[PDB]
Design a protein around this ligand. Structure first.
Ligand SMILES: [Zn+2]
Ligand SMILES: [Zn+2]
Lengths: 608, 606
């Protein structure tokens, strides 16, 4: 009996308005690396079948949000380096398929580089040296060895935050750090030492967002920023050569990033939702692609050349846009979440995060209608879905059908087109999911922290004494109390499909199984989790008797308990970093989970 | 043993830069009607199976391009009226027998109303009267009975082309005709007669492109045009009430169409690639939707309200855009061809048309990289396709990889990454499909009109003597003639998948089967078609012995011949109006066809 990972739908790259998201690409594995929340991801761009893991997730930064992730330049080393807001940089490696037939991530080294957040990281061409930058205390960056962390020079010439850096990928070695107040600094080394600064070519007060030496001999170094200027310097002497400008193509928005496709051409991306490919020698824009400027999410905040004329651009809305020099049309777009997933539905698969974003995976439709945490999703009506959010609205297919007088804390929908909601004013509301009309309501005796709606009942977890009250869906004046209460505030409740049982967990990790009809406890032997229970879902028959119940908690784990054998547990550890939020049976033999890491995972459940 | 229709992928609405495309929608059947080429289509919007046929195709306008198709208002009547460039209006009805999956189209009446082209048509609310408008020598429109064609009034007040009309959908009946030079005319009736003219509210020389009375009581009438003005008139008196303008929402482009959602709100769409919903009373833009203005193809040419807040906008690029009031994001998009299909690939399914448009059905990616007819498509390389066009280029995934010194007339690729091209200068070129490099060539002793490339041979139809010359791929210096020449110019050639036989048809309708090795005719029994042959494709095994051969002809038919029994034929008549252009077996039992009518059809072969 087991639960094995079947598929991982990674999140999109994290993004911030007015900030660049530095991406990374590896030719050998044809993968891109990027941060999202407290994790660093490596996504393979391949299709069909390959030897490369579809996804590699690194959670070693713990409680610190990851800022950047960079592949080592050494082919096949399978090493990477990432930094976080706490100012810590980590060198780690992965391995896939062996005795385990799974991915293994190992920290090779870690150093506390800066006080404040790290903004960018760069490897030397040997993959043994690192230029780490950001904004610490009286120190905005360093040059260190990848293994011991010893200093290999100094970052200087900056009185403000450094936004990007890059090391010439060849001898003689040179470096460039770029930052706020239009500051740019050239270095020679190792040991990397200040060579010259420049604050005349980029407007003062401007944000110089990115820098990169041309490939091969690195004869050129280019810097770009919010002042929409493209500065070209000599890759060895650091002298200013000229601005890259084409009178037939004015840059209309602040630039966020660049990336060379080869030794003569490079792409720039900015707030004007335009991707441009420039030729350094002629200074002409040989290619460009645009998106509707009227949509804030279309701003391009990151970009990376992926070999042979291919380019991947990152939109502010987290979407990855695929282009190819010589083809005037975008090849494809990949969208998704980059914020914790708080709501899930199955058949069809629909997800919602804490920023209000909803994903319709059947049609790859991404929505940004809601503006806050998605409380619940209902897909009981053919081709439609109803969502509730902390923005105080209920929307049907992205259209507001009800405005909440009180913020909905939690909610649960059955299969008949109804949804039970618990508000901040302690009211239990029953709404017609696809019309938005409140059909009936009752004021709870105390605040409610969890609700489960079955065909005929409404189970509510009361914060007063952590008790569970069960109402008749047909008459909210009629209810009964489960004899035994939980030991802490109810966190999640789930009435069995036949309504024979009611599983209920609390914020401590305790889960109790009740016999709905006798309102008595049937078993209290289900292992304590020492962590908040976030999801409970009953397994459907392919024997028809209810038994196995999947559960996820803040302890990142997935425990499938058994009514019949309370001591029998099939589990999958480390399902989601910072906790499994939703869990459902897409199939009698397959589970789908989602977590605070903004990932959605499918699992095969084998009873053997 | 038979061929039955399995699926129909209808074209997109026909479109023209600077012109509006008047769409029609029927609530009762949840379908939309629109023109494309010389056909009128009705596409059901239903996602889940219903009693309504997915597609209805009227081909009665014959050789004349269809310009507008309108549903009758009578719920369930199943009648429609369409007009064409020859100035002919036709009232027709369809019947659908789900079980047989058969659609019957009957012509109720046809009237030659204008000398010139028809631009718009409107039914009265009783579905018994018609306002037909356009650009004629003597008249620009008429008012007639749907059954007798007898006049029910007179169109007047216009000295220039009329672009559209509408009949107030209630008594007292009224009408509005709109046209060039910013002229607007209001009528009363029946008998519909001139009531008042207005060449003051729309700029002189501008094109008033659309007009529509509000639903129900029709208290209002609105006109829109290239001058960017939205003029609101009283539905009963015709008196100008006010310009519909929102200080917070300026119209930055010529308007092409409008459609009332209800009695208070309507939508306008135009050259500024923006769909706007207004409220006549407040005069405010209640909702807006935009597409990237930097792309010509996003200009909006048509629009129609489909009820309950739903709206469909038509892009200049033929794409249908689905929106819904109160939802700031596009629901979905439907793209495709609106020009005859000329190239076809299978597994995955890719199609190309004579405007150079290429569609990747597997991912629903519509391409406009080429600027002219697609001569051929090759999808032999994994996740990639090579296309050759009359724009003189060979592209790989939409990127030019070769520029021809002489225009490619026809081309044929095999499964090994090669393509044989016959140029306008009579050269046979062998190119690597995915690099664009020419690796070998030879000047033919005559112009070539057809090619077939197999693993080892190149079959070429020569226009001089109508002979077939078969070169050895590995050495263009080695070639042999098939003993018997064709009766006429070769039009399509296909070498057997084992290279045992060679099927060849000419522009007259004759197809001959040759034995490649002995270069002798194996059978000349296959029925003559009195119509040029455009396609030949051998059926693959699920005995292995080659036998069935699918063939498409200009006369619209599909004939599957037999090598074993030359007299037996499995046919599918009327597969594509104006001719089946391409045929391929995406499966041993499923034949895929493309036609001059821009449709793609899948057939099951019993
Ligand atoms: Zn939406
Ligand atoms: Zn394209």
């Amino acid at each position: 009996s087991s639960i094995s990972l079947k598929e991982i739908i990674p999140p999109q790259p994290s993004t911030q308005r007015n900030f660049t998201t530095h991406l990374s690409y590896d030719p050998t594995t044809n993968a891109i690396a990027y941060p999202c929340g407290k994790s660093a991801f490596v996504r393979c761009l391949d299709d069909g079948d390959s030897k490369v893991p579809p996804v590699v997730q690194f959670t070693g930064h713990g409680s610190s949000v990851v800022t950047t992730v960079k592949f080592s330049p050494i082919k096949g080393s399978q090493y990477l380096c990432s930094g976080d807001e706490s100012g810590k940089v980590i060198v780690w490696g992965w391995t896939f398929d062996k005795e385990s037939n799974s991915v293994e991530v190992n920290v090779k080294s870690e150093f506390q580089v800066l006080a404040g957040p790290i903004s960018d990281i760069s490897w030397d061409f040997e993959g043994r040296r690192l230029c780490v930058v950001g904004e610490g205390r009286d120190n905005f960056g360093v040059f260190i060895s990848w293994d011991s962390g010893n200093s290999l020079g100094e970052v200087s010439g900056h009185s403000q935050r450094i936004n990007a850096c890059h090391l010439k990928q060849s001898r003689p070695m040179r470096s460039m750090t770029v930052g706020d107040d239009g500051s740019v600094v050239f270095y020679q080394g190792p040991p990397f030492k200040f060579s010259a600064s420049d604050r005349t070519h980029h407007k003062q007060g401007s944000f110089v967002r990115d820098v990169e030496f041309s490939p091969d001999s690195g004869e050129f170094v280019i810097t770009v920023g919010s002042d929409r200027k493209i500065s070209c310097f000599d890759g060895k002497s650091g002298e200013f050569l000229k601005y890259i400008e084409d009178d037939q193509e004015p840059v209309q928005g602040g630039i966020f990033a660049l990336s060379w496709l080869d030794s003569q051409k490079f792409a720039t991306v900015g707030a004007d939702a335009t991707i441009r490919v420039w030729d350094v020698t002629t200074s002409k824009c040989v290619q460009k692609w645009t998106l509707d400027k009227q949509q804030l999410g279309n701003q391009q905040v990151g970009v990376v050349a992926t070999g042979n004329g291919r380019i991947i651009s990152l939109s502010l809305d987290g979407t990855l846009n695929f282009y190819e020099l010589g083809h005037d049309e975008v090849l494809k777009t990949i969208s998704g979440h980059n914020k914790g997933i708080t709501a899930l539905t199955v058949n069809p698969l629909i997800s919602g995060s804490y920023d209000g974003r909803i994903m319709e995976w059947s049609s790859s439709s991404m929505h940004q209608d809601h503006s806050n945490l998605i409380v619940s999703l209902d897909n009981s009506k053919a081709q439609e879905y109803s969502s509730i959010s902390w923005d105080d609205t209920l929307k049907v297919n992205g259209i507001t059908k009800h405005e909440f007088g009180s913020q909905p804390k939690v909610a649960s929908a059955n299969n008949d087109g109804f949804t039970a909601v618990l508000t901040n004013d302690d009211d239990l509301l029953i709404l017609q999911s696809f019309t938005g009309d409140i059909i009936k309501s009752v004021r709870l005796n105390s605040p409610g922290s969890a609700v489960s709606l079955s065909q005929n009942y409404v189970a509510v977890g009361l914060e007063e004494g952590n008790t569970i009250q069960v109402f008749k869906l047909s008459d909210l004046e009629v209810s009964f109390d489960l004899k035994t209460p939980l030991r802490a505030k109810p966190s999640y409740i789930s009435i069995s499909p036949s309504e024979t049982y009611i599983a209920a967990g609390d914020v401590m990790g305790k889960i109790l199984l009740y016999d709905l009809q006798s309102r008595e406890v049937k078993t209290s032997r289900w292992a304590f989790r020492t962590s908040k229970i976030n999801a409970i879902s009953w397994k459907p028959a392919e024997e028809i008797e209810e038994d196995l119940v999947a559960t996820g908690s803040l302890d990142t784990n997935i425990f499938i308990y058994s009514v019949k054998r309370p001591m029998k547990i099939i589990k999958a550890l480390n399902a989601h970093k910072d906790g499994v939020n939703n869990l459902l049976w897409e199939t009698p033999s397959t589970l789908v989970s989602s977590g605070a890491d903004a990932c959605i995972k499918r699992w095969n459940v084998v009873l053997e």
